[PDB]
């Protein structure tokens, strides 16, 4: 129902755990193109080492160019230490801030799971639904509502 | 127990921003918020803007974007979050809550907390007035009117 | 030991669970008058629906009038959902913000208990100490130190 | 082995649980004087009712006078309700804020323990190391590095 | 990562508590940048603070006096008998994230929050573990470059 051919979307994704990132980035892109008439040349895809750099990657990017919506994609898996918990907390509050500070919609495409299986399942593998598809429509809608 | 009011706010302009995930619970709430304001607080239908966003995460940004274009006396953020298999529930709830509180304090506009953070669907519906529960949306409506008036 | 007859104090309390709120507001007021020589005319008592509106009730108020200290009073009880947890967090961080932003002392008179019994006990009922008295003295002292 | 004779330090401590506070404030002071050549007349010691007023006490103070470093000292013990949890969280984030906002180093001298015994042990009693000494050096070092 | 940054000025601020683990980390971060990213030794400032609490303030104070392209905050926090670990970790983490978003300078998270010494050392490359300091070095170089060009 929502078409956004004049929309410029930015996708910033971490590179840790690419087995799950790719399906997500891919689904987010295809859904916007095939279902929302977004033009491929209007979709910038940038990356950062890990999820911690996510907020900063987005902030730096929406300062140089102009986008209508941004999607932050990353995957965090609980480890042996308290790392997962603290990073997850920081990046989440961070993304929310970068969005409220700039006035640019920031779609939350961060997965915070207990194990690899859970991440892949939410990436569309092994019978699960690909959450990247949802983030794509979300970005399109927020972009339009922001004009 | 919650102590609402009998205040009248016919000149108030109210904004309601709700997510669309889990509409089975959202509708009753939104509807409750609206009826209570009209039938009990003399708020005029034309003065009630109802906008939506995909999910609860876009709730704060939706409100911020909207209270910048138009002028409202109070805002109500409605959404439903249910605990899943991952830590998703935990982190989103935390971000959105801190977020609503900020949009409110930054702008100076009252923001009523109409976000349900439950463990399962059943709990959500119950607080939506179904299966014998009390509709929390009615509560949010009187709170919105009251905060609207106290903000002059 | 401190006297503050020229002090103007603001009290904003939620209305949910008045069985506990009243004793607290009363203890805060009496303690200031009978023990700190604060004048009744100089004490503004306002209310809001619930604890969530507490930060905004205070921000709105200390912007229209001038107070030397404020007391935020509310009672939150753990329910069946994660509600209690998330609202508590937000109100606490929020009260702290309103106080640091404005420069006005904000006394924390917010009870975060597991049940009604605990709330009343800290309101001075059933053999407990009334915490509102404590908040009153805190308000006077902070008011004076703020000059 | 850092000397800071020209440093002006500020110490704001809460008054609740003085049995533990004193040893801490005293250790911080002694260490600075005896080991870092800090002048007694350049040390301001102020107090507030409780830990909640800690952030506001410091903000107010580093606005009237000029200090090179500040030390916030308080003791929080877990009780029967969730009070401990929420106040600890708010005070901690608050102290960190006052420090980043102003540009004045703020040393974290806040003990968040499960019981009185743990508080006293970290105050140097019953065979424990007095943490106030550590806070004193930290303050001196941060004061000098802030130039 | 085949990125080279010979014109980059990197800042490293590390706490001094628990040096047995800090050193391997700081060393790994520095060797990695130089040997693998052509970063010049004279363009790498290494500063320290007493503990992890002072980490955010140390970085803020430093990126205000000089100009850096990226900063790395290194420290080690270990769970104790009290709630200290929990609250400090929380504050420092949110703090580092803020110093970075406020200034516009990339801040790499080199803070280990572990349950015991063994876990820290293992992540510092000892006893058969991978040195995380290396990763932070590459990260710093990449963020530094993406923040310019």
UniProtKB/Swiss-Prot annotation, chain B:
Activity regulation field: Competitively inhibited by riboflavin (Ki of 17 uM).
Active site: residue positions: 88
GO annotation, cellular component aspect: cytoplasm; mitochondrial intermembrane space; nucleus; riboflavin synthase complex
GO molecular function: 6,7-dimethyl-8-ribityllumazine synthase activity; riboflavin binding; riboflavin synthase activity
One record GO biological process: riboflavin biosynthetic process
Entry's family note: Belongs to the DMRL synthase family.
Record protein name field: 6,7-dimethyl-8-ribityllumazine synthase
Gene expressing this chain: rib4
